[PDB]
Design a binder for this molecule. Structure first.
Ligand code: HEM
Ligand SMILES: CC(C)C1=CC2=CC[C@@H]3[C@](C)(CCC[C@@]3(C)C(=O)N[C@@H](Cc3c[nH]c4ccccc34)C(=O)O)[C@H]2CC1
Ligand SMILES: [Mg+2]
Length: 455
């Protein structure tokens, strides 16, 4: 039977638009999903989308014969500086499939063996920072995790050191990138974007785009000039040819890919590490089990690629953190053709869906009644998880190309953190999830007591 779709409260001619005029729109949409269920319509002047929350419907949304990736307005604003890089391109753009084919082998699990040493370089810098704190000091967790992930992507992406652990004020590139991302997200809630109050925003935005383009174009040009071969993604992109077209990426698209790796990877990955450490300090028995694994496996001063692969419980901790607070919390799809969703909701060609990942990850028909509990052991037998129940890295050919990189990074770093320190939730921190591009536990702080194990 065709079913009428629920809709949240309306504001006359503004329809549902004012519901997203909030500091925490994803958390607001999760509460609407709690009230309305697995699907609801969201209307604004000149647009409609449908928010999906159940595995039953998201399994169908994930059918690539029926639905393709849509660029959300969020992605369209980011496209002003990420261009036709992989994250902000339509599947049908020539540069999407070309870059996908060229870059997939450079992002495989096997390829992580080549990035491992660079990841260890930055991870050791984090450990040494914390070893060097005085008794009276604490750790700003998301702040340090972001220094780590930015620097790791910079070193593995284009052999560039942002030297974030040497600074209070980030490298100008990072200052410009973070300010451009802030501006792109701020434009989602901006009613009068041509008001003169935004003249400075528009000028600063063009300045920040030029800062990013100028540095990355220079490093590409420096690399081509020198002929130097490194273990970075820039080497792979300069050397690569798409088997289909037989073409390489041009220098402009290479620049957009480098900017994209930093944008797509830095705050998702640092949020994952921040939420994982938050859940560990709030669940001491889970922290103890993860710390026992780190001590048994990481028997050398420097972790190896093989040792990171044997941090199985650490991997389960990270998957459980992605279950509860996936740091890229939504993605957008469009209907390729007229179709019926779930035997109940007719859609026309071009109709849009939003996947509300945190709500999917709370589907009690999949996970059971204990969905709010942090229980990594629920990932012990993953073959038992029904299709499309767990989607922190998106879907299909448009899924996260960085998934293996992010998880190798996060497993290495969390393993080293748990080997080298005991952690104290010294403030009894109250979770406050700040929403920007990403989700993070705002103001999460801990104290780290060294186990005095040499590097
Ligand atoms: C260094 C780390 C990372 C890099 C370099 C990276 C890179 C990318 C790229 C290039 C894409 C676009 C793939 C394509 O469409 O061809 C993508 C998509 C995505 N990534 Fe990542 N990523 C990273 C980490 C993460 C993390 C940690 C998460 C989540 C916790 C995440 C979630 C996603 C999601 C959900 C998409 C799909 C977006 C959509 O459907 O619109 N990424 N990533
Ligand atoms: C760039 C990547 C990393 C991101 C992807 C995102 C996808 C969905 C977003 C997002 C979570 C930010 C908050 C709004 C939300 C949930 C959304 O539905 N947004 C819809 C609907 C919408 C909200 N405000 C709008 C204003 C104009 C047009 C559409 C909208 C949209 O962006 O399309 C946002 C975070 C950043
Ligand atoms: Mg506020």
């Amino acid at each position: 039977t065709i079913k009428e779709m629920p809709q949240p409260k309306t504001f006359g001619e503004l329809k549902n638009l004012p519901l997203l005029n909030t500091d925490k729109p994803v958390q607001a949409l999760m509460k609407i999903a709690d009230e309305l269920g697995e699907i609801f319509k969201f209307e604004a002047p000149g647009r409609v989308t449908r928010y999906l929350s159940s595995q039953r419907l998201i399994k169908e949304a994930c059918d690539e014969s029926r639905f393709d990736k849509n660029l959300s307005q969020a992605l369209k604003f980011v496209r002003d500086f990420a261009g036709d890089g992989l994250f902000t391109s339509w599947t049908h753009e020539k540069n999407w499939k070309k870059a996908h084919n060229i870059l997939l082998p450079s992002f495989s699990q096997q390829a992580m063996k080549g990035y491992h040493a660079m990841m260890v370089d930055i991870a050791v810098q984090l450990v040494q920072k914390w070893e060097r704190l005085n008794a009276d000091e604490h750790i700003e967790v998301p702040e340090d995790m972001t220094r780590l992930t930015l620097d790791t992507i910079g070193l593995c992406g284009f052999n560039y050191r942002f030297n974030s652990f040497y600074r209070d004020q980030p490298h100008p590139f990072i200052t410009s990138m973070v300010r451009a991302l802030d501006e792109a997200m701020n434009k989602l809630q901006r009613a009068n974007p041509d008001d003169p109050a935004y003249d400075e925003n528009k000028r600063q935005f063009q300045e920040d785009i030029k800062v990013m383009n100028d540095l990355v174009d220079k490093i590409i040009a420096d690399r081509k000039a020198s002929g130097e071969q490194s273990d970075d993604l820039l080497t792979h992109m300069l050397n690569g040819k798409d088997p289909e077209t037989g073409e390489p990426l041009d220098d402009e698209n290479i620049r957009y890919q480098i900017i994209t790796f930093l944008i797509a990877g830095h705050e998702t990955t640092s949020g994952l590490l921040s939420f994982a450490l938050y859940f560990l300090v709030k669940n001491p028995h889970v922290l103890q089990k993860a710390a026992e694994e780190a001590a048994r496996v990481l028997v050398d001063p420097v972790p190896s690629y093989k040792q990171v692969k044997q941090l199985k419980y650490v991997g389960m901790v990270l998957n459980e953190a992605l279950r509860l607070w996936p740091t890229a919390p939504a993605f957008s799809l469009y209907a390729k053709e007229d179709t019926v969703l779930g035997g109940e909701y007719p859609l026309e060609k071009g109709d849009e869906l939003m996947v509300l990942i945190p709500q999917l990850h709370r589907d009690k028909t999949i996970w059971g009644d204990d969905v709010e509990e942090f229980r990594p052991e629920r990932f012990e037998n993953p073959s038992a998880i029904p299709q499309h129940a767990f989607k922190p890295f998106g879907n299909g050919q448009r899924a996260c190309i960085g998934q293996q990189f992010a998880l190798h990074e996060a497993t290495l770093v969390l393993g080293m953190m748990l080997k080298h320190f005991d952690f104290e939730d010294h403030t009894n921190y109250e979770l406050d999830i700040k929403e920007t591009l990403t989700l993070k536990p705002e103001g999460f702080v801990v104290k780290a007591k060294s186990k005095k194990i040499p590097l």
